[PDB]
């Protein structure tokens, strides 16, 4: 239960592609209450990304199957129940992250880049909840996502260079929120195009540490733009 040991085990779990183990280690690190280093922060994010990603992918498959089996009630009821079980896992994972975010990560964020990272993450995990939200709760979930993204967005435009990978990654995910959650293609495109164009005009401000991350995100911004406007 030592911190450096937990971090090393997390790295080992990542190599082994055992992301449940990875998330458990990094959760334990976070719960010790100290602000996460950049490396620790990224390990936590990678771990939960894979843990929730597996559920998101499974959910899409099963929800799709559920829809296409109308009039075969026994098979559909079976598909529905399985979707709901996956959904419960998914919600528990998102609530796990969102709780760590409220209790430790966002309050301990001393610098702007860290505050943007965590607010972005809060935006993401509410967005994943919104993907599977139905009825009453959806509008509330959607507003929680939007508000976290919006605050991150404003802070990033004030404190970070246009080519900063965290600022670009936020624009990318916030544009996806507009496209997929708010059904506003036009606002999604505007946001993506601006982020891309402002980064393009300043490639000299890239560093050796971030030029690969930043240029990959730019490429994805443009990939999305192309798809959305076809």
């Amino acid at each position: 239960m030592d911190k450096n040991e937990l971090v090393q085990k997390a790295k080992l779990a990542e190599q082994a592609e055992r992301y449940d183990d990875m998330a458990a280690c990094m959760k334990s690190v976070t719960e010790q209450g100290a602000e996460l280093s950049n490396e620790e922060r990224n390990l936590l994010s990678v771990a939960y990304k894979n843990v929730v990603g597996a559920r998101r992918s499974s959910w899409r498959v099963v929800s799709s199957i559920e829809q296409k089996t109308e009039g075969a009630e026994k098979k559909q009821q079976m598909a529905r129940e399985y979707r709901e079980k996956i959904e419960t896992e998914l919600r528990d994972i998102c609530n796990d992250v969102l709780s760590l975010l409220e209790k430790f990560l966002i309050p301990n964020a001393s610098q702007a880049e860290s505050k943007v990272f965590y607010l972005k993450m809060k935006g993401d995990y509410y967005r994943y909840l919104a993907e599977v939200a139905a009825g009453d709760d959806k509008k509330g979930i959607v507003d929680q996502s939007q508000q976290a993204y919006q605050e991150a967005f404003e802070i990033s435009k004030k404190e970070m260079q246009p080519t900063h990978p965290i600022r670009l990654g936020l624009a990318l995910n916030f544009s996806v929120f507009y496209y997929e959650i708010l059904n506003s293609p036009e606002k999604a495109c505007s946001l993506a195009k601006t982020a891309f164009d402002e980064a393009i005009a300043e490639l000299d401000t890239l560093s050796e540490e971030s030029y690969k991350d930043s240029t990959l995100i730019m490429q994805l911004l443009r990939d999305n733009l192309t798809l959305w406007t076809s």
């Binding site: 990224n42 994010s45 990678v46 990304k49 993401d124 990654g169 990318l172 995910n173 996806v176 496209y179 997929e180 990959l216 995100i217 994805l220 990939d223 999305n224 798809l227 959305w228």
Partner: peptide
């Protein structure tokens, strides 16, 4: 081809 979000 599908919508992509931030990879890491």
């Amino acid at each position: 081809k599908r919508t992509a979000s931030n990879p890491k």
